[model samples]
Target: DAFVGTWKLVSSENFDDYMKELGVGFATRKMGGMAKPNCIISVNGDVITIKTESTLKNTEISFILGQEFDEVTADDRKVKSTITLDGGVLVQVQKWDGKSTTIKRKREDDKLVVECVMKGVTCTRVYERA
Candidate 1:
């Protein structure tokens, strides 16, 4: 699979604002801002697993395309999540407590680009192959 690889965080934009929209607390938001998370993606048949490791905390999410499952976010929010792949881009939608967010991942050159959107705020995180 194209996304089956390890990616190291290179840079981020507007992550603070995105976290704020998600109602993350001061301490956790600060830690999240300072941490450089590494993302590991693997695919086995129709299932995909994504692991994010950082100094603050580590999170792992596994799901199949178009299938909904329960997810606990890194910030400890529980959500119903679904993932879909389209034209090499992977899109994940999460809904919880009447709130929703979308995360999209795609490869650009040697970097993996991830976009997080919530409450009209968008955060971009770029990752290089590890």
Candidate 2:
């Protein structure tokens, strides 16, 4: 697995705006904005697991490709999630209350790039191997 490794946050852009579009509350968004989480990705058989850890909280999600799963986001929103691999990118779509968001993660050279979009807002986060 290209993404089966531990990645540490290196940078972020417009993350608050993307969180806002997801209807995250003001306090939650503020706290979310302050946290820089590390991502741990692993795969076993057909199941892929993503573990997020930070000073604030830790979250783990496991899913199989093309299968729908219930996901509770870092901001604590419940959503229906589907993940797929396109080219070398891991693309995920999360839907809730008629609203949706998209997250695409790909390994680029020595860094991991993540693009998250909700409505017209996009958040770019880059990570380096930890």
Candidate 3:
């Protein structure tokens, strides 16, 4: 319920492990560690407009809170997705290429719990609220 404001990624969980699993090179990981992702979300009723910006990419996503939509990823990849709710939490189901990623997000204490699954790996990141 406290996730109504803008948030920034200041750190990541299992950074090296996740990066390696994603096949990101050392240089890219280094850069990503230094890069900041600015996330802004505007929720009005059941509609949400989300904007995420970073040095590498920027993205904007808008949808009815529990409905499906199309998304063009930051890398120019396209995906079909649906964002829904589990209790008061938000969940996103995305299909890309031949794979899919389901991401669940919720506020935990002063942090955001982001759980993502792709390519048989389930990665989780806890981002502090800023």
C-alpha TM-score for every candidate: 0.97, 0.97, 0.79
Q: Pull out the clashing pairs in model 3.
A: none
| Per-residue lDDT over 52-86 for candidate 2, one digit per residue giving the tens place of the 0 to 100 score | 99987899999999999999888888999999999
lDDT of each prediction vs. the true structure? 0.93, 0.93, 0.73
**Local accuracy of candidate 1 as per-residue lDDT tens digits, 43-81:** 988889999998779999889899999999988899999
Arranged by lDDT with the best first, the candidates are 2, 1, 3
Q: In each prediction, how many residue pairs overlap at the backbone (N, C-alpha, C within less than 3 A)?
A: 0, 0, 0
lDDT of 2 at 88: 92
- Superposed by TM-score, candidate 2 places the C-alpha of residue 45 at a distance from the truth, in angstroms, of 0.6
Score candidate 1 by lDDT. 0.93
- Over 1-130, each residue of candidate 3 has an lDDT whose tens digit, in order, gives 3566778886565545555555567776676565668777778887788788788777899999667799986544588889987776889988866766677888887877788766667767666656
lDDT of 3: 0.73
